[PDB]
PDB file of all heavy atoms in Angstrom:
ATOM      1  N   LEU A  27     -27.158  20.552 -56.272  1.00 56.35           N
ATOM      2  CA  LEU A  27     -25.809  20.621 -56.846  1.00 56.35           C
ATOM      3  C   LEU A  27     -25.416  22.019 -57.186  1.00 56.35           C
ATOM      4  O   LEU A  27     -26.246  22.902 -57.189  1.00 56.35           O
ATOM      5  CB  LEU A  27     -25.614  19.659 -58.008  1.00 56.35           C
ATOM      6  CG  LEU A  27     -26.156  18.263 -57.861  1.00 56.35           C
ATOM      7  CD1 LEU A  27     -25.851  17.440 -59.071  1.00 56.35           C
ATOM      8  CD2 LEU A  27     -25.590  17.602 -56.595  1.00 56.35           C
ATOM      9  N   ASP A  28     -24.099  22.231 -57.466  1.00 57.56           N
ATOM     10  CA  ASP A  28     -23.580  23.604 -57.642  1.00 57.56           C
ATOM     11  C   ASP A  28     -23.746  24.452 -56.458  1.00 57.56           C
ATOM     12  O   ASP A  28     -24.630  25.272 -56.380  1.00 57.56           O
ATOM     13  CB  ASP A  28     -24.259  24.288 -58.926  1.00 57.56           C
ATOM     14  CG  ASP A  28     -23.751  25.662 -59.157  1.00 57.56           C
ATOM     15  OD1 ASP A  28     -22.661  25.828 -59.761  1.00 57.56           O
ATOM     16  OD2 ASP A  28     -24.456  26.627 -58.734  1.00 57.56           O
ATOM     17  N   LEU A  29     -22.858  24.186 -55.471  1.00 57.04           N
ATOM     18  CA  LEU A  29     -22.826  24.959 -54.188  1.00 57.04           C
ATOM     19  C   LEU A  29     -21.418  25.398 -53.959  1.00 57.04           C
ATOM     20  O   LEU A  29     -20.544  24.501 -53.826  1.00 57.04           O
ATOM     21  CB  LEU A  29     -23.393  24.117 -53.054  1.00 57.04           C
ATOM     22  CG  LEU A  29     -24.906  23.899 -52.832  1.00 57.04           C
ATOM     23  CD1 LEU A  29     -25.186  23.283 -51.509  1.00 57.04           C
ATOM     24  CD2 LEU A  29     -25.649  25.221 -52.994  1.00 57.04           C
ATOM     25  N   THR A  30     -21.116  26.669 -53.853  1.00 59.08           N
ATOM     26  CA  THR A  30     -19.829  27.182 -53.556  1.00 59.08           C
ATOM     27  C   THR A  30     -19.506  26.763 -52.071  1.00 59.08           C
ATOM     28  O   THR A  30     -20.330  26.382 -51.322  1.00 59.08           O
ATOM     29  CB  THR A  30     -19.699  28.668 -53.678  1.00 59.08           C
ATOM     30  OG1 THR A  30     -20.466  29.310 -52.568  1.00 59.08           O
ATOM     31  CG2 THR A  30     -20.312  29.142 -54.995  1.00 59.08           C
ATOM     32  N   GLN A  31     -18.206  26.882 -51.741  1.00 57.25           N
ATOM     33  CA  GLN A  31     -17.758  26.484 -50.396  1.00 57.25           C
ATOM     34  C   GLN A  31     -18.376  27.497 -49.349  1.00 57.25           C
ATOM     35  O   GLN A  31     -18.475  27.163 -48.200  1.00 57.25           O
ATOM     36  CB  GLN A  31     -16.276  26.559 -50.303  1.00 57.25           C
ATOM     37  CG  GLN A  31     -15.570  25.765 -51.392  1.00 57.25           C
ATOM     38  CD  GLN A  31     -14.167  26.225 -51.708  1.00 57.25           C
ATOM     39  OE1 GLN A  31     -13.747  26.231 -52.896  1.00 57.25           O
ATOM     40  NE2 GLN A  31     -13.425  26.543 -50.721  1.00 57.25           N
ATOM     41  N   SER A  32     -18.708  28.679 -49.784  1.00 58.46           N
ATOM     42  CA  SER A  32     -19.325  29.645 -48.926  1.00 58.46           C
ATOM     43  C   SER A  32     -20.872  29.493 -48.792  1.00 58.46           C
ATOM     44  O   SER A  32     -21.437  29.737 -47.714  1.00 58.46           O
ATOM     45  CB  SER A  32     -19.058  31.126 -49.406  1.00 58.46           C
ATOM     46  OG  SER A  32     -17.647  31.251 -49.712  1.00 58.46           O
ATOM     47  N   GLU A  33     -21.530  29.006 -49.876  1.00 59.03           N
ATOM     48  CA  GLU A  33     -22.936  28.756 -49.758  1.00 59.03           C
ATOM     49  C   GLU A  33     -23.242  27.654 -48.790  1.00 59.03           C
ATOM     50  O   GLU A  33     -24.253  27.733 -48.048  1.00 59.03           O
ATOM     51  CB  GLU A  33     -23.508  28.436 -51.160  1.00 59.03           C
ATOM     52  CG  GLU A  33     -23.514  29.614 -52.115  1.00 59.03           C
ATOM     53  CD  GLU A  33     -24.173  29.247 -53.432  1.00 59.03           C
ATOM     54  OE1 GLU A  33     -24.226  28.118 -53.857  1.00 59.03           O
ATOM     55  OE2 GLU A  33     -24.611  30.212 -54.123  1.00 59.03           O
ATOM     56  N   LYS A  34     -22.421  26.632 -48.717  1.00 58.25           N
ATOM     57  CA  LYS A  34     -22.534  25.574 -47.679  1.00 58.25           C
ATOM     58  C   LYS A  34     -22.351  26.136 -46.329  1.00 58.25           C
ATOM     59  O   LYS A  34     -22.874  25.613 -45.349  1.00 58.25           O
ATOM     60  CB  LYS A  34     -21.575  24.418 -48.038  1.00 58.25           C
ATOM     61  CG  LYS A  34     -21.916  23.720 -49.345  1.00 58.25           C
ATOM     62  CD  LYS A  34     -20.890  22.596 -49.580  1.00 58.25           C
ATOM     63  CE  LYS A  34     -21.192  21.833 -50.857  1.00 58.25           C
ATOM     64  NZ  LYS A  34     -20.128  20.908 -51.252  1.00 58.25           N
ATOM     65  N   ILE A  35     -21.441  27.175 -46.206  1.00 57.56           N
ATOM     66  CA  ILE A  35     -21.225  27.776 -44.876  1.00 57.56           C
ATOM     67  C   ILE A  35     -22.409  28.607 -44.493  1.00 57.56           C
ATOM     68  O   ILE A  35     -22.810  28.753 -43.347  1.00 57.56           O
ATOM     69  CB  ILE A  35     -19.931  28.575 -44.854  1.00 57.56           C
ATOM     70  CG1 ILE A  35     -18.727  27.602 -44.910  1.00 57.56           C
ATOM     71  CG2 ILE A  35     -19.829  29.436 -43.691  1.00 57.56           C
ATOM     72  CD1 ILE A  35     -18.734  26.667 -43.705  1.00 57.56           C
ATOM     73  N   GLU A  36     -23.060  29.282 -45.459  1.00 59.35           N
ATOM     74  CA  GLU A  36     -24.260  30.145 -45.190  1.00 59.35           C
ATOM     75  C   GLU A  36     -25.406  29.214 -44.690  1.00 59.35           C
ATOM     76  O   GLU A  36     -26.238  29.664 -43.832  1.00 59.35           O
ATOM     77  CB  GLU A  36     -24.640  30.925 -46.332  1.00 59.35           C
ATOM     78  CG  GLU A  36     -25.805  31.880 -46.016  1.00 59.35           C
ATOM     79  CD  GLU A  36     -26.603  32.297 -47.265  1.00 59.35           C
ATOM     80  OE1 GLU A  36     -27.018  31.324 -47.979  1.00 59.35           O
ATOM     81  OE2 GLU A  36     -26.888  33.479 -47.462  1.00 59.35           O
ATOM     82  N   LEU A  37     -25.536  28.032 -45.200  1.00 57.00           N
ATOM     83  CA  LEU A  37     -26.587  27.126 -44.727  1.00 57.00           C
ATOM     84  C   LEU A  37     -26.207  26.685 -43.295  1.00 57.00           C
ATOM     85  O   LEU A  37     -27.104  26.611 -42.434  1.00 57.00           O
ATOM     86  CB  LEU A  37     -26.776  25.921 -45.643  1.00 57.00           C
ATOM     87  CG  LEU A  37     -27.294  26.242 -47.028  1.00 57.00           C
ATOM     88  CD1 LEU A  37     -27.274  25.076 -47.947  1.00 57.00           C
ATOM     89  CD2 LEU A  37     -28.720  26.823 -46.955  1.00 57.00           C
ATOM     90  N   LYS A  38     -24.994  26.327 -43.026  1.00 56.37           N
ATOM     91  CA  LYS A  38     -24.551  26.019 -41.732  1.00 56.37           C
ATOM     92  C   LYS A  38     -24.835  27.145 -40.740  1.00 56.37           C
ATOM     93  O   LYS A  38     -25.253  26.903 -39.577  1.00 56.37           O
ATOM     94  CB  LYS A  38     -23.022  25.740 -41.724  1.00 56.37           C
ATOM     95  CG  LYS A  38     -22.642  24.236 -41.587  1.00 56.37           C
ATOM     96  CD  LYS A  38     -22.362  23.884 -40.152  1.00 56.37           C
ATOM     97  CE  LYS A  38     -21.792  22.425 -40.003  1.00 56.37           C
ATOM     98  NZ  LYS A  38     -21.470  22.057 -38.627  1.00 56.37           N
ATOM     99  N   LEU A  39     -24.722  28.411 -41.183  1.00 59.09           N
ATOM    100  CA  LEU A  39     -25.028  29.554 -40.310  1.00 59.09           C
ATOM    101  C   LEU A  39     -26.532  29.657 -39.997  1.00 59.09           C
ATOM    102  O   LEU A  39     -26.886  29.958 -38.880  1.00 59.09           O
ATOM    103  CB  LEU A  39     -24.484  30.827 -40.985  1.00 59.09           C
ATOM    104  CG  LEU A  39     -24.712  32.130 -40.196  1.00 59.09           C
ATOM    105  CD1 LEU A  39     -24.215  32.042 -38.786  1.00 59.09           C
ATOM    106  CD2 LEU A  39     -24.129  33.251 -40.991  1.00 59.09           C
ATOM    107  N   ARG A  40     -27.326  29.447 -41.046  1.00 62.07           N
ATOM    108  CA  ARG A  40     -28.787  29.560 -40.817  1.00 62.07           C
ATOM    109  C   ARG A  40     -29.210  28.398 -39.904  1.00 62.07           C
ATOM    110  O   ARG A  40     -30.114  28.600 -39.113  1.00 62.07           O
ATOM    111  CB  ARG A  40     -29.501  29.513 -42.186  1.00 62.07           C
ATOM    112  CG  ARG A  40     -29.129  30.597 -43.067  1.00 62.07           C
ATOM    113  CD  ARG A  40     -29.667  30.368 -44.522  1.00 62.07           C
ATOM    114  NE  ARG A  40     -31.106  30.261 -44.563  1.00 62.07           N
ATOM    115  CZ  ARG A  40     -31.864  30.160 -45.626  1.00 62.07           C
ATOM    116  NH1 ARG A  40     -31.271  30.162 -46.827  1.00 62.07           N
ATOM    117  NH2 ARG A  40     -33.194  29.993 -45.560  1.00 62.07           N
ATOM    118  N   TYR A  41     -28.562  27.235 -40.039  1.00 62.60           N
ATOM    119  CA  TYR A  41     -28.851  26.102 -39.122  1.00 62.60           C
ATOM    120  C   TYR A  41     -28.573  26.443 -37.690  1.00 62.60           C
ATOM    121  O   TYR A  41     -29.375  26.234 -36.822  1.00 62.60           O
ATOM    122  CB  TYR A  41     -28.067  24.828 -39.575  1.00 62.60           C
ATOM    123  CG  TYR A  41     -28.006  23.852 -38.471  1.00 62.60           C
ATOM    124  CD1 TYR A  41     -29.015  22.928 -38.254  1.00 62.60           C
ATOM    125  CD2 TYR A  41     -26.837  23.727 -37.661  1.00 62.60           C
ATOM    126  CE1 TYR A  41     -28.937  21.967 -37.247  1.00 62.60           C
ATOM    127  CE2 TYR A  41     -26.784  22.798 -36.679  1.00 62.60           C
ATOM    128  CZ  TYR A  41     -27.824  21.909 -36.469  1.00 62.60           C
ATOM    129  OH  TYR A  41     -27.759  20.908 -35.505  1.00 62.60           O
ATOM    130  N   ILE A  42     -27.371  27.078 -37.436  1.00 60.93           N
ATOM    131  CA  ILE A  42     -26.953  27.383 -36.066  1.00 60.93           C
ATOM    132  C   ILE A  42     -27.935  28.354 -35.449  1.00 60.93           C
ATOM    133  O   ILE A  42     -28.429  28.110 -34.312  1.00 60.93           O
ATOM    134  CB  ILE A  42     -25.530  27.998 -36.054  1.00 60.93           C
ATOM    135  CG1 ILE A  42     -24.535  26.900 -36.441  1.00 60.93           C
ATOM    136  CG2 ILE A  42     -25.187  28.595 -34.760  1.00 60.93           C
ATOM    137  CD1 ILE A  42     -23.124  27.402 -36.650  1.00 60.93           C
ATOM    138  N   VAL A  43     -28.357  29.414 -36.172  1.00 61.61           N
ATOM    139  CA  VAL A  43     -29.289  30.385 -35.595  1.00 61.61           C
ATOM    140  C   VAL A  43     -30.641  29.711 -35.374  1.00 61.61           C
ATOM    141  O   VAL A  43     -31.303  29.954 -34.319  1.00 61.61           O
ATOM    142  CB  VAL A  43     -29.460  31.530 -36.571  1.00 61.61           C
ATOM    143  CG1 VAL A  43     -30.647  32.408 -36.167  1.00 61.61           C
ATOM    144  CG2 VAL A  43     -28.195  32.384 -36.509  1.00 61.61           C
ATOM    145  N   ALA A  44     -31.044  28.809 -36.250  1.00 62.18           N
ATOM    146  CA  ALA A  44     -32.284  28.066 -36.027  1.00 62.18           C
ATOM    147  C   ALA A  44     -32.210  27.266 -34.759  1.00 62.18           C
ATOM    148  O   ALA A  44     -33.186  27.193 -33.995  1.00 62.18           O
ATOM    149  CB  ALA A  44     -32.606  27.211 -37.235  1.00 62.18           C
ATOM    150  N   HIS A  45     -31.039  26.635 -34.538  1.00 61.67           N
ATOM    151  CA  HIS A  45     -30.876  25.859 -33.305  1.00 61.67           C
ATOM    152  C   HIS A  45     -30.868  26.759 -32.080  1.00 61.67           C
ATOM    153  O   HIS A  45     -31.638  26.446 -31.147  1.00 61.67           O
ATOM    154  CB  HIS A  45     -29.551  25.022 -33.438  1.00 61.67           C
ATOM    155  CG  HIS A  45     -29.403  23.900 -32.449  1.00 61.67           C
ATOM    156  ND1 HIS A  45     -30.412  23.018 -32.263  1.00 61.67           N
ATOM    157  CD2 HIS A  45     -28.404  23.539 -31.687  1.00 61.67           C
ATOM    158  CE1 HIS A  45     -30.010  22.149 -31.369  1.00 61.67           C
ATOM    159  NE2 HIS A  45     -28.816  22.385 -30.990  1.00 61.67           N
ATOM    160  N   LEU A  46     -30.147  27.822 -32.062  1.00 63.14           N
ATOM    161  CA  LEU A  46     -30.039  28.628 -30.917  1.00 63.14           C
ATOM    162  C   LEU A  46     -31.368  29.319 -30.599  1.00 63.14           C
ATOM    163  O   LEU A  46     -31.646  29.639 -29.469  1.00 63.14           O
ATOM    164  CB  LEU A  46     -28.928  29.664 -31.095  1.00 63.14           C
ATOM    165  CG  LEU A  46     -27.507  29.138 -31.272  1.00 63.14           C
ATOM    166  CD1 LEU A  46     -26.458  30.218 -31.340  1.00 63.14           C
ATOM    167  CD2 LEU A  46     -27.168  28.201 -30.048  1.00 63.14           C
ATOM    168  N   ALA A  47     -32.162  29.598 -31.640  1.00 61.61           N
ATOM    169  CA  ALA A  47     -33.512  30.210 -31.372  1.00 61.61           C
ATOM    170  C   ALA A  47     -34.373  29.142 -30.656  1.00 61.61           C
ATOM    171  O   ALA A  47     -35.158  29.570 -29.780  1.00 61.61           O
ATOM    172  CB  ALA A  47     -34.091  30.675 -32.655  1.00 61.61           C
ATOM    173  N   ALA A  48     -34.342  27.936 -31.026  1.00 64.81           N
ATOM    174  CA  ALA A  48     -35.156  26.935 -30.399  1.00 64.81           C
ATOM    175  C   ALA A  48     -34.734  26.683 -28.932  1.00 64.81           C
ATOM    176  O   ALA A  48     -35.593  26.620 -28.047  1.00 64.81           O
ATOM    177  CB  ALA A  48     -35.113  25.612 -31.149  1.00 64.81           C
ATOM    178  N   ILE A  49     -33.408  26.566 -28.671  1.00 64.41           N
ATOM    179  CA  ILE A  49     -32.921  26.352 -27.328  1.00 64.41           C
ATOM    180  C   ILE A  49     -33.301  27.574 -26.442  1.00 64.41           C
ATOM    181  O   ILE A  49     -33.874  27.351 -25.336  1.00 64.41           O
ATOM    182  CB  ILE A  49     -31.451  26.130 -27.326  1.00 64.41           C
ATOM    183  CG1 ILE A  49     -31.155  24.695 -27.952  1.00 64.41           C
ATOM    184  CG2 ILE A  49     -30.877  26.157 -25.934  1.00 64.41           C
ATOM    185  CD1 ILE A  49     -29.700  24.449 -28.010  1.00 64.41           C
ATOM    186  N   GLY A  50     -33.025  28.721 -26.901  1.00 63.72           N
ATOM    187  CA  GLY A  50     -33.354  29.933 -26.120  1.00 63.72           C
ATOM    188  C   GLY A  50     -34.838  30.076 -25.834  1.00 63.72           C
ATOM    189  O   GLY A  50     -35.229  30.387 -24.723  1.00 63.72           O
ATOM    190  N   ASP A  51     -35.647  29.877 -26.843  1.00 62.32           N
ATOM    191  CA  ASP A  51     -37.039  30.200 -26.697  1.00 62.32           C
ATOM    192  C   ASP A  51     -37.787  29.160 -25.848  1.00 62.32           C
ATOM    193  O   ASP A  51     -38.737  29.470 -25.089  1.00 62.32           O
ATOM    194  CB  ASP A  51     -37.721  30.359 -28.072  1.00 62.32           C
ATOM    195  CG  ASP A  51     -37.352  31.659 -28.750  1.00 62.32           C
ATOM    196  OD1 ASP A  51     -36.406  32.320 -28.242  1.00 62.32           O
ATOM    197  OD2 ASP A  51     -37.971  32.044 -29.735  1.00 62.32           O
ATOM    198  N   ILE A  52     -37.312  27.876 -25.849  1.00 63.14           N
ATOM    199  CA  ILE A  52     -37.789  26.909 -24.929  1.00 63.14           C
ATOM    200  C   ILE A  52     -37.472  27.362 -23.477  1.00 63.14           C
ATOM    201  O   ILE A  52     -38.329  27.274 -22.598  1.00 63.14           O
ATOM    202  CB  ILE A  52     -37.174  25.498 -25.208  1.00 63.14           C
ATOM    203  CG1 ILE A  52     -37.769  24.999 -26.532  1.00 63.14           C
ATOM    204  CG2 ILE A  52     -37.445  24.580 -24.075  1.00 63.14           C
ATOM    205  CD1 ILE A  52     -39.222  24.574 -26.405  1.00 63.14           C
ATOM    206  N   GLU A  53     -36.245  27.869 -23.289  1.00 60.18           N
ATOM    207  CA  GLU A  53     -35.875  28.281 -21.977  1.00 60.18           C
ATOM    208  C   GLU A  53     -36.669  29.480 -21.508  1.00 60.18           C
ATOM    209  O   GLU A  53     -37.158  29.603 -20.370  1.00 60.18           O
ATOM    210  CB  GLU A  53     -34.318  28.644 -21.973  1.00 60.18           C
ATOM    211  CG  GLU A  53     -33.471  27.415 -22.104  1.00 60.18           C
ATOM    212  CD  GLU A  53     -33.807  26.340 -21.114  1.00 60.18           C
ATOM    213  OE1 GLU A  53     -33.344  26.440 -19.925  1.00 60.18           O
ATOM    214  OE2 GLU A  53     -34.553  25.426 -21.505  1.00 60.18           O
ATOM    215  N   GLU A  54     -36.824  30.587 -22.376  1.00 58.96           N
ATOM    216  CA  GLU A  54     -37.522  31.713 -21.886  1.00 58.96           C
ATOM    217  C   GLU A  54     -39.052  31.468 -21.800  1.00 58.96           C
ATOM    218  O   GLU A  54     -39.752  32.313 -21.188  1.00 58.96           O
ATOM    219  CB  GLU A  54     -37.261  32.942 -22.828  1.00 58.96           C
ATOM    220  CG  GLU A  54     -37.993  32.926 -24.185  1.00 58.96           C
ATOM    221  CD  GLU A  54     -38.005  34.299 -24.868  1.00 58.96           C
ATOM    222  OE1 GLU A  54     -38.236  35.264 -24.167  1.00 58.96           O
ATOM    223  OE2 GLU A  54     -37.775  34.383 -26.082  1.00 58.96           O
ATOM    224  N   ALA A  55     -39.602  30.366 -22.286  1.00 57.98           N
ATOM    225  CA  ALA A  55     -40.975  30.026 -22.063  1.00 57.98           C
ATOM    226  C   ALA A  55     -41.162  29.443 -20.664  1.00 57.98           C
ATOM    227  O   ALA A  55     -42.119  29.636 -20.008  1.00 57.98           O
ATOM    228  CB  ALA A  55     -41.480  29.040 -23.147  1.00 57.98           C
ATOM    229  N   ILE A  56     -40.191  28.577 -20.238  1.00 56.95           N
ATOM    230  CA  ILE A  56     -40.184  28.093 -18.945  1.00 56.95           C
ATOM    231  C   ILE A  56     -39.998  29.225 -17.876  1.00 56.95           C
ATOM    232  O   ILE A  56     -40.623  29.267 -16.822  1.00 56.95           O
ATOM    233  CB  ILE A  56     -39.116  26.982 -18.667  1.00 56.95           C
ATOM    234  CG1 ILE A  56     -39.318  25.870 -19.638  1.00 56.95           C
ATOM    235  CG2 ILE A  56     -39.144  26.426 -17.271  1.00 56.95           C
ATOM    236  CD1 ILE A  56     -40.688  25.203 -19.598  1.00 56.95           C
ATOM    237  N   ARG A  57     -39.140  30.179 -18.201  1.00 59.26           N
ATOM    238  CA  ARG A  57     -38.807  31.259 -17.270  1.00 59.26           C
ATOM    239  C   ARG A  57     -40.040  32.202 -17.148  1.00 59.26           C
ATOM    240  O   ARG A  57     -40.345  32.673 -16.025  1.00 59.26           O
ATOM    241  CB  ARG A  57     -37.578  32.048 -17.754  1.00 59.26           C
ATOM    242  CG  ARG A  57     -37.239  33.224 -16.874  1.00 59.26           C
ATOM    243  CD  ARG A  57     -36.023  33.998 -17.449  1.00 59.26           C
ATOM    244  NE  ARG A  57     -36.224  34.318 -18.864  1.00 59.26           N
ATOM    245  CZ  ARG A  57     -36.825  35.377 -19.298  1.00 59.26           C
ATOM    246  NH1 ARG A  57     -37.333  36.274 -18.431  1.00 59.26           N
ATOM    247  NH2 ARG A  57     -36.943  35.594 -20.579  1.00 59.26           N
ATOM    248  N   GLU A  58     -40.696  32.499 -18.266  1.00 60.97           N
ATOM    249  CA  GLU A  58     -41.836  33.347 -18.192  1.00 60.97           C
ATOM    250  C   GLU A  58     -43.021  32.680 -17.449  1.00 60.97           C
ATOM    251  O   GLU A  58     -43.839  33.343 -16.824  1.00 60.97           O
ATOM    252  CB  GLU A  58     -42.289  33.772 -19.553  1.00 60.97           C
ATOM    253  CG  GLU A  58     -41.413  34.901 -20.200  1.00 60.97           C
ATOM    254  CD  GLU A  58     -41.553  35.052 -21.670  1.00 60.97           C
ATOM    255  OE1 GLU A  58     -42.496  34.381 -22.248  1.00 60.97           O
ATOM    256  OE2 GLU A  58     -40.777  35.744 -22.309  1.00 60.97           O
ATOM    257  N   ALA A  59     -43.056  31.374 -17.546  1.00 60.70           N
ATOM    258  CA  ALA A  59     -44.134  30.678 -16.765  1.00 60.70           C
ATOM    259  C   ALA A  59     -43.854  30.639 -15.255  1.00 60.70           C
ATOM    260  O   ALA A  59     -44.748  30.736 -14.484  1.00 60.70           O
ATOM    261  CB  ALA A  59     -44.240  29.210 -17.272  1.00 60.70           C
ATOM    262  N   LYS A  60     -42.547  30.518 -14.902  1.00 61.20           N
ATOM    263  CA  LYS A  60     -42.184  30.619 -13.483  1.00 61.20           C
ATOM    264  C   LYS A  60     -42.450  31.993 -12.901  1.00 61.20           C
ATOM    265  O   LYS A  60     -43.006  32.135 -11.832  1.00 61.20           O
ATOM    266  CB  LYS A  60     -40.739  30.236 -13.273  1.00 61.20           C
ATOM    267  CG  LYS A  60     -40.423  28.724 -13.403  1.00 61.20           C
ATOM    268  CD  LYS A  60     -38.918  28.463 -13.135  1.00 61.20           C
ATOM    269  CE  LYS A  60     -38.610  27.018 -13.453  1.00 61.20           C
ATOM    270  NZ  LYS A  60     -37.148  26.736 -13.247  1.00 61.20           N
ATOM    271  N   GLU A  61     -42.072  33.057 -13.677  1.00 60.00           N
ATOM    272  CA  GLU A  61     -42.386  34.392 -13.275  1.00 60.00           C
ATOM    273  C   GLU A  61     -43.891  34.665 -13.181  1.00 60.00           C
ATOM    274  O   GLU A  61     -44.320  35.519 -12.444  1.00 60.00           O
ATOM    275  CB  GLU A  61     -41.687  35.366 -14.204  1.00 60.00           C
ATOM    276  CG  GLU A  61     -40.172  35.301 -14.150  1.00 60.00           C
ATOM    277  CD  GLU A  61     -39.487  36.271 -15.124  1.00 60.00           C
ATOM    278  OE1 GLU A  61     -40.185  36.981 -15.884  1.00 60.00           O
ATOM    279  OE2 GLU A  61     -38.228  36.310 -15.095  1.00 60.00           O
ATOM    280  N   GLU A  62     -44.699  33.957 -14.044  1.00 62.86           N
ATOM    281  CA  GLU A  62     -46.135  34.066 -13.931  1.00 62.86           C
ATOM    282  C   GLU A  62     -46.579  33.452 -12.662  1.00 62.86           C
ATOM    283  O   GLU A  62     -47.525  33.854 -11.972  1.00 62.86           O
ATOM    284  CB  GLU A  62     -46.844  33.444 -15.156  1.00 62.86           C
ATOM    285  CG  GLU A  62     -47.310  34.437 -16.220  1.00 62.86           C
ATOM    286  CD  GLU A  62     -48.498  35.253 -15.727  1.00 62.86           C
ATOM    287  OE1 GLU A  62     -48.324  36.230 -15.014  1.00 62.86           O
ATOM    288  OE2 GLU A  62     -49.671  34.917 -16.106  1.00 62.86           O
ATOM    289  N   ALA A  63     -46.053  32.303 -12.278  1.00 63.59           N
ATOM    290  CA  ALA A  63     -46.424  31.562 -11.064  1.00 63.59           C
ATOM    291  C   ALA A  63     -45.987  32.288  -9.799  1.00 63.59           C
ATOM    292  O   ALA A  63     -46.765  32.384  -8.844  1.00 63.59           O
ATOM    293  CB  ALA A  63     -45.802  30.120 -11.031  1.00 63.59           C
ATOM    294  N   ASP A  64     -44.795  32.887  -9.823  1.00 66.59           N
ATOM    295  CA  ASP A  64     -44.339  33.652  -8.689  1.00 66.59           C
ATOM    296  C   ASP A  64     -45.108  34.988  -8.554  1.00 66.59           C
ATOM    297  O   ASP A  64     -45.103  35.606  -7.458  1.00 66.59           O
ATOM    298  CB  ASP A  64     -42.835  33.960  -8.817  1.00 66.59           C
ATOM    299  CG  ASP A  64     -41.970  32.684  -8.861  1.00 66.59           C
ATOM    300  OD1 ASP A  64     -42.536  31.568  -8.805  1.00 66.59           O
ATOM    301  OD2 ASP A  64     -40.722  32.815  -8.880  1.00 66.59           O
ATOM    302  N   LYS A  65     -45.754  35.428  -9.635  1.00 66.84           N
ATOM    303  CA  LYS A  65     -46.592  36.616  -9.519  1.00 66.84           C
ATOM    304  C   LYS A  65     -47.953  36.264  -8.973  1.00 66.84           C
ATOM    305  O   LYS A  65     -48.526  37.194  -8.272  1.00 66.84           O
ATOM    306  CB  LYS A  65     -46.834  37.226 -10.942  1.00 66.84           C
ATOM    307  CG  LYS A  65     -47.040  38.726 -10.945  1.00 66.84           C
ATOM    308  CD  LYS A  65     -46.938  39.297 -12.364  1.00 66.84           C
ATOM    309  CE  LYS A  65     -45.567  39.041 -12.956  1.00 66.84           C
ATOM    310  NZ  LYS A  65     -45.441  39.538 -14.317  1.00 66.84           N
ATOM    311  N   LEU A  66     -48.485  35.081  -9.061  1.00 65.63           N
ATOM    312  CA  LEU A  66     -49.616  34.648  -8.413  1.00 65.63           C
ATOM    313  C   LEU A  66     -49.367  34.253  -7.003  1.00 65.63           C
ATOM    314  O   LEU A  66     -50.339  34.241  -6.194  1.00 65.63           O
ATOM    315  CB  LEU A  66     -50.293  33.445  -9.168  1.00 65.63           C
ATOM    316  CG  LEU A  66     -50.547  33.602 -10.632  1.00 65.63           C
ATOM    317  CD1 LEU A  66     -51.315  32.397 -11.200  1.00 65.63           C
ATOM    318  CD2 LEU A  66     -51.320  34.886 -10.916  1.00 65.63           C
TER     319      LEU A  66
END
């Protein structure tokens, strides 16, 4: 309790970055594995 309207927005912002980091890093792990396979 006791959360300003902006503090709730800062948590929303940390959530979004957490989400985008997971989506991107899953993708760049598949991409680096393909580039490893194409190098072999």
